[PDB]
Amino acid sequence: LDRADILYNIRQTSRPDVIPTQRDRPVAVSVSLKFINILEVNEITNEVDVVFWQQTTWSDRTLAWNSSHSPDQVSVPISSLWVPDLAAYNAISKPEVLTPQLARVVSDGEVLYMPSIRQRFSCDVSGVDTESGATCRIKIGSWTHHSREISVDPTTDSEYFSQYSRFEILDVTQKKNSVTYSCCPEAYEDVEVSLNFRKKG
Amino acid sequence: LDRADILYNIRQTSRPDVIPTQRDRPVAVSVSLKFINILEVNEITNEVDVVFWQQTTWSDRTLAWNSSHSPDQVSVPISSLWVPDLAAYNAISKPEVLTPQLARVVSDGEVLYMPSIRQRFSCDVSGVDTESGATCRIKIGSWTHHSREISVDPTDDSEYFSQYSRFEILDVTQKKNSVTYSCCPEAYEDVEVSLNFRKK
Amino acid sequence: LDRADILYNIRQTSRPDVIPTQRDRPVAVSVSLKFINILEVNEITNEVDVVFWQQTTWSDRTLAWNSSHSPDQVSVPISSLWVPDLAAYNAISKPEVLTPQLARVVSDGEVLYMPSIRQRFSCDVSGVDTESGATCRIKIGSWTHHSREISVDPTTENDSEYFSQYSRFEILDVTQKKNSVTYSCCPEAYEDVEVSLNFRKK
Amino acid sequence: LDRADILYNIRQTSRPDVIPTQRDRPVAVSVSLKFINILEVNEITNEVDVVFWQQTTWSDRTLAWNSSHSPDQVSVPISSLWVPDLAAYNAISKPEVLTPQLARVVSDGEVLYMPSIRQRFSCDVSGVDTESGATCRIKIGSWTHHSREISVDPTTNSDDSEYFSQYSRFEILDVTQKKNSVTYSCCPEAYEDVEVSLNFRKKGR
Amino acid sequence: LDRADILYNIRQTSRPDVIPTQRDRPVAVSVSLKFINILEVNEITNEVDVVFWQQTTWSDRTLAWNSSHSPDQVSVPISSLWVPDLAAYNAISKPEVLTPQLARVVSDGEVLYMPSIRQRFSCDVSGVDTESGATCRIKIGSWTHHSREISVDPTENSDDSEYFSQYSRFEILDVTQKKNSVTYSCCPEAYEDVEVSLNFRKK
Ligand SMILES: *[C@@H]1O[C@H](CO)[C@@H](O)[C@H](O)[C@H]1NC(C)=O
Ligand SMILES: *[C@@H]1O[C@H](CO)[C@@H](O)[C@H](O)[C@H]1NC(C)=O
Ligand SMILES: *[C@@H]1O[C@H](CO)[C@@H](O)[C@H](O)[C@H]1NC(C)=O
Ligand SMILES: c1cnc2c(c1)ccc1cccnc12
Ligand SMILES: c1cnc2c(c1)ccc1cccnc12
């Protein structure tokens, strides 16, 4: 009926350890990085330290509620929620969470989680000081769940990029991938985010 | 009641996950940054490292109590109450909280949480060596709640600044913003603190 | 009694969130900074990185026990206690506490928590290389409790005996005076202890 | 069952602090490091900064379920599992896990925990600029459980540099995994460790 | 008993905050530092950054079990155990525990806690580049319990210069572990120490 009841009901029935696979078809996770800032770039070590928005979207029907005389959306801490086990495959630092750790939950079960991450990556810095800039690929996909459980998909440049960064974005491409691990035959999916940037001076 | 009863009552009944909106109105959150120190400034990267008191104030009627013969205010760990999910939109580091995680709650339900935060931002350092100084804009607002849920508003902000930093405050002006994105048909409010400072 | 029972009574009753106000009088907290080492002096930015034992003392009779054939003191984790919410107003880093966070509890309710803390401060470093040295002031006081709830008092009874013999610096004097602020919002008085650290390079 | 039922049963029955033996036989722990990136090398201090996936495998039959009309394997938080108390014996930094701390649990009781860990080590860095490269040995073994309780043996997958960053200053030449049985703490019992030798060199620009 | 039962009994009955004083006599805690690596040395500031194994042994009779048809030793998370409140008096940094925080408990009540700790200390670094080396003393003892509650002693039964990294930029010459008793001039009680004199030099 009210916000307190929904968050009470959500707290007590949300199964955070349980992926909401429905009729055993994959959970469609939509990940798009909104780049905000690029801090320290190294063309020698091929390392970048970047701040970006991880727009993450999925549906968890275990959260749904009747909206007749009730809020249309609530704000839920992700500790009381299932969050996809996303990992940046080429990160060389642990993701540093800048924002409060809440996701927005819609009454129909849609979940919107977008944390601020400061993280270091190993990618192609060659050409960052040149005219056409450097192209840095960041690969994000489920860490443990394969294609039958989590399906990751892009939304398809950033308008939220800080004008005061020493670097500037030229183009951002994010495409979907499908890989196979060298041990095990089922298929693990990732989204490929290509960051085209250069120095200003 | 005496303090033990109130703090028992607040701990066991507070819905820390629940926003205390009254009759579908937004929680009036009052943000004023009291700047304490600027430690590292870098004009090449346009980054500042700042220590400040993030004075935050709101009203939570679920915390109130009848204070006829009882204390007028208590001190509650912010884990046992709902705190607005504020986030500095232009920060490049996680807030380093230097003070205890306690809030002040008055008998009527007003809550005052003012932690000391050392945090790095990306803002305009250009002109920090000049006479008129550099002006660094910091935009602070709720990360998940929109305008009908949290309304942010400002309330002498250079009275506690360290007389020992290589930097000095010239002017501090605070305006509030309200943005509507092409995604979301709701309005998102933030307080933008423009910090005028220069080199010694 | 015995240690196992005493700590049971403290564990099961002591209200870590509740300040032990008695007859609505302020809780007299006694703060004395025992400086151990000065680790990073910077005269350009006026910043010091210092390690110190924060001798903090108050009385909490909700912990007391009749000390017949019983221990006169035990050792209690700070999670099972109310600890004053002291904060160095001029600190520029999080306090890094080096020792385990146990406090000493006397049978009458007196509590002693004296942790070793490494913390960086913004204070007066100018003159550290001259002979009489620079004096760096540290202001520590309760962050939420005002003058009627927590009263801070220096101990004016003692450093230069626990300071590291291997430090690049040497302590000249340590003086503690009391302060009281009234902030522009609320007609309360908020108390802090101002610890003056007179030190120089050797 | 379904995933929710399995994870309910596992969450509510896990004795995570209890090592999962049976017939008082040692737990078959299989550890093999897949190196992902070499970040900082220091030839003067003989210190290396490395990112690697620590593929760890053991069998815990208490997690098993009848898989008839049921999921084949699920994903369980390592907080709801016993994980071997493995430690890099020559480490000079705390292990930093970059990935979610989830393990993969199969209906037969098999567990797959493969975290991406960035850690600094003390090993022989001398020769990283030569052609044949430097050899960095990493000693991994249980910190408290001995050979009769935890036996470490490295695993089988494929290429030694199949997940190694092509953008690292360095390139892997060979990755060797050897098993040992020596003495830790004091004297009796047999204490096993896996010795992972990392052959790497600077890249030829 | 089986492994799960013993660890259950310890979890539910171990008094982690309660010191296990025996016959109202002090708890004999035995400290031995196994030096593993010397990382950063600074002769001007007199600071060393060290990785070492803190081998700790004590007896807690409340932890025991009849070892009949049951395991003779288990590994218990120190969250379910009493661990002495040891602190390095000469430390200038957080002790960085690198290993899992499990302790080994024998059916007789003896407990073994030996974590790998990376910590910085303030000691005499002068002479680290010379032939005889510097002597860096590290004093380890209980932080809140005094001598009649906790008695701290070295384990000299220690062979510690045996696990040191051959690849450290520095080399150990001597390690002495002696017993000390430090009394602060404020207060009459005395806190016992292990005094580790670490004689090492640069290569
Ligand atoms: C508050 O308490 C006083 C004292 O009992 C009572 O007279 C008064 O009606 C109360 N006010 C409320 C509940 O608003
Ligand atoms: C405390 O000491 C005695 C001895 O056990 C105890 O019986 C008594 O109740 C207490 N004495 C007083 C005066 O309260
Ligand atoms: C322990 O149990 C064994 C048999 O289970 C028995 O022989 C022995 O006496 C017991 N120890 C004690 C002290 O009762
Ligand atoms: C700036 C601040 N908050 C937001 C956005 C941008 C974009 C989306 C969004 C969705 C829910 C809550 N907040 C935001
Ligand atoms: C420093 C510390 N605490 C405070 C202030 C300054 C100012 C106002 C205030 C109001 C209530 C509680 N604490 C404080």
Author numbering:
A (entry chain C): 20 to 175, 180 to 224
B (entry chain B): 20 to 174, 179 to 223
C (entry chain A): 20 to 177, 180 to 223
D (entry chain D): 20 to 175, 177 to 225
E (entry chain E): 20 to 174, 176 to 223
Question: What do the study authors state?
Answer:
AChBPs are homopentameric, water-soluble homologs of the ligand-binding domain of LGICs and well-established structural surrogates for nicotinic acetylcholine receptors (nAChR). Importantly, AChBPs can bind nAChR-specific ligands and induce similar conformational changes as in the membrane bound receptors. LGICs are activated by ligands binding at subunit interfaces of their extracellular domains, thereby inducing conformational changes that affect the structure of a central pore and its ability to transport ions through the membrane.
Surface Acoustic Wave (SAW) biosensor technology was used to confirm that distortions observed in SPR biosensor data for interactions between compounds VUF6105, VUF22430, and VUF24234, and AChBP indeed result from ligand-induced conformational changes. The three VUF compounds resulted in significant ΔSHG responses with all labelling variants, with VUF22430 giving very high signals. Similarly, VUF6105 resulted in a significant compaction, while VUF24234 resulted in an expansion. As seen from the different conformational changes induced by each compound, this analysis revealed that the binding modes of VUF6105 and VUF24234 are different. The unit cell was comprised of two or four pentamers of Ls-AChBP in the presence of FL1613, FL1856, FL1888, FL3044, VUF24234 and VUF6105. Notably, binding of FL1888, VUF24234 and VUF6105 results in a movement of the loop closer to the compound, while binding of FL1856, FL3044, FL1613 and FL1909 does not have the same effect. The violin plot revealed that conformational changes in loop C occurred to a higher degree in the AChBP structures with compounds FL1888, VUF24234 and VUF6105 than in the other structures.
